[PDB]
């Protein structure tokens, strides 16, 4: 394959709203901060995260660099929701 330019993308924070189930994610994209939203969805014991349309587009663009990136984001999210202490920042993509 060709060269895909590498990046450092970190997850800086996860803010979960117990009432609305909304989730605010703050990423660092090579130092530039950006906020994306999602909604937590537990239905018939299926533990899902409904990314916003723009978050899904963003994740799809970096999947070629790290196909595990939703597993990382999801793992952190469920730990946060369950009240575990999570040390941030958490690497999503590194060079």
């Amino acid at each position: 394959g060709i060269v895909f330019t590498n990046h450092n993308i970190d997850l800086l924070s996860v803010e979960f709203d117990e009432i609305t189930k909304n989730c605010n994610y703050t990423f660092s994209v090579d130092g530039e901060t950006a906020i994306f939203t999602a909604r937590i969805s537990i239905i018939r014991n299926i533990k899902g995260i409904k990314y916003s349309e723009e978050l899904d587009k963003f994740i799809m663009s970096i999947m070629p660099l790290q196909p595990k990136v939703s597993k990382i984001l999801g793992g952190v999210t469920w730990d946060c929701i369950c009240g575990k202490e999570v040390g941030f920042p958490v690497r999503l993509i590194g060079k």
Partner: protein
């Protein structure tokens, strides 16, 4: 497509994708077919690759489809709803590949209908969980 499978057979009941990106729409056609809705992959749109865009399109012909990143641990709860679509993304690939998860057999293996060649095969639950990137289209 380098992931490990067994008992693979060509199966003309699996809908074969018509283009590289067509696997989402091919899965979408089979997902709707299982619910007595008959829409060709061309009408669904063989450019659709993201779970958001695929669930949104299925909800033009049906109702109640979700397109979410799902935990590995929800595999059996997903298959309890019927067939669902899983985005496979193996190491080194620059693209995802949608497959239809038909169910799980009695030994717990995952039964896959794959539109790449139009085949049916099995995967161990552990291997399936590693290659599936969590992105999923399903109808609770």
């Amino acid at each position: 497509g380098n992931w490990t499978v067994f008992d693979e057979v060509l199966d003309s009941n699996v809908i074969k994708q018509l283009t590289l990106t067509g696997c989402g729409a091919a899965c979408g056609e089979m997902l709707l077919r299982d619910r007595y809705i008959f829409v060709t992959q061309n009408v669904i749109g063989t450019e659709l690759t993201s779970m958001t865009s695929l669930a949104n399109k299925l909800n033009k012909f049906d109702v109640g489809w979700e397109g979410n990143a799902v935990s590995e641990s929800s595999l059996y709860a997903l298959s309890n709803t019927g067939s669902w679509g899983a985005m496979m993304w193996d190491s080194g690939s620059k693209v995802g590949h949608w497959v239809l998860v038909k169910g799980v057999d009695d030994a717990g293996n995952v039964i896959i209908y794959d539109p790449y060649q139009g085949s049916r095969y099995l995967m161990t639950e552990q291997e399936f969980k590693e290659v599936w990137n969590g992105h999923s289209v399903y109808k609770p």
